[PDB]
Assembly symmetry: none
Homo-oligomer: 245 residues x 2
């Protein structure tokens, strides 16, 4: 594998009211902005430094995010790696121990299916511990033996006195994914700002949580600015990156 | 944990054949040292003794099969023979039941239905032979026992089950078929040896008819008679702890 070099440019600006607004340069000449070396970035930066910044478009809309499916072997490995920093073989050793102790279901599966007993169990837990608004009218179904889930939803990670810290973290991950998969969607009020500067286009995205839904068990607020408003550039910050395997 | 020792004695018969012995008594009382000093004291004595066969008992023996599984005995057998914990065993048994491969897994009864008895006796007659089939169905001290739903379904055929689930089904299947088969027969032997203040023993048996062990799978003591002199080769002490 050969790492590919690419640069990104962020711009700190101030709204007419004086509030801070962070932007990411996305386009240059209507084409995706992605310089590959320092000189190219510097050339772009020199242009952005003199350009006039103005809000081209502001889009506000409600959005929802649904929970993910309960774990299968491949998704558990991916999540344990991303969230906990566990390698695949370590994740599988720990999952096998949790299964052999009877804490979770069989760990080698490619099915997201959940038995009626498991659905009854988790929906009861949700009704008792979270509330009616967190419970969908009908069980949530997922594209797809059974998924990897706790054997007893009433058993919490901290109660596994026979497991070391990382094993408890893995159980907690499995437990949270399973409970969340049967909860209602999270609701947000999203905002997207599009800014123009010379032959450059920049953007900022933000959202405000209206209902937590599944996120209760398991980006920022953009300042007020309308279309046509002028933004004052404060600082440009280029960043060098390299792709990974 | 309680520390206790044992002592094994390797000897040779007049013909020169090896004979392994275990020390069982000392001064007519059960031998069971609790430390290294006690054991070493016994070893020094055994090292200077004359060894001779005090008695040889040869007799036929019988081994009957066990009852079909109930929840508690399945858990015990899965632990002892397969190394499965209780929770794991019950999770797998539940899946086998839900798939329809075995009968309900929560039971305290060793009873078998007339249909199940007819089915397994037919299997035995077809696959093992008349000497493996008792005149009347075998009865056991005691809903129904945990058994396969279809005796013609072999563990190897459960494509939808992982290896350990197949091992569990195999265990249940073998226990069920064996429980309706005839006793195994052996010719047993017990050698009692005298060595100074100690008594040592060796046990052996030869299979004469496999019976139930045919579906659900010791030593052969060398030829020696009462009065035969034995030559001590080596004494081997062993330290143990209760678990």
């Amino acid at each position: 594998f050969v790492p590919e070099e690419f640069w990104e440019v962020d711009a700190s600006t101030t709204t007419p009211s004086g509030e801070a607004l962070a932007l990411q340069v996305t386009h240059q000449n209507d084409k995706p902005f992605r310089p590959v070396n320092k000189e190219q970035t510097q050339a772009a930066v020199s242009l952005l430094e003199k350009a006039r910044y103005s809000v081209l478009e502001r889009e506000d809309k409600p959005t929802t995010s649904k929970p993910g499916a309960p774990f299968i072997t491949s998704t558990l490995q991916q999540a344990a790696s991303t969230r906990l920093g566990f390698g695949v073989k370590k994740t599988m050793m720990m999952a096998q121990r949790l299964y052999e102790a009877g804490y979770i279901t069989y760990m080698r599966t490619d099915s997201t299916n959940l038995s009626q007993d498991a659905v009854n169990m988790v929906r009861g837990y949700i009704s008792d511990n979270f509330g009616k608004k967190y419970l969908p009218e009908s069980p949530n179904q997922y594209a797809s033996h059974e998924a990897i889930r706790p054997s007893d939803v009433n058993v919490m990670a901290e109660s596994l006195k026979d497991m070391e810290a990382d094993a408890q973290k893995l159980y907690q991950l499995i437990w949270r994914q399973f409970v969340a998969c049967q909860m209602t969607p999270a609701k947000y009020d999203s905002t997207t700002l599009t800014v123009g500067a010379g032959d450059f286009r920049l953007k900022a995205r933000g959202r405000i949580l209206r209902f937590d839904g599944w996120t209760k068990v398991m980006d920022r607020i953009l300042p007020a600015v309308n279309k046509g408003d002028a933004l004052t550039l404060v600082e440009l910050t280029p960043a060098q990156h390299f792709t990974k395997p």
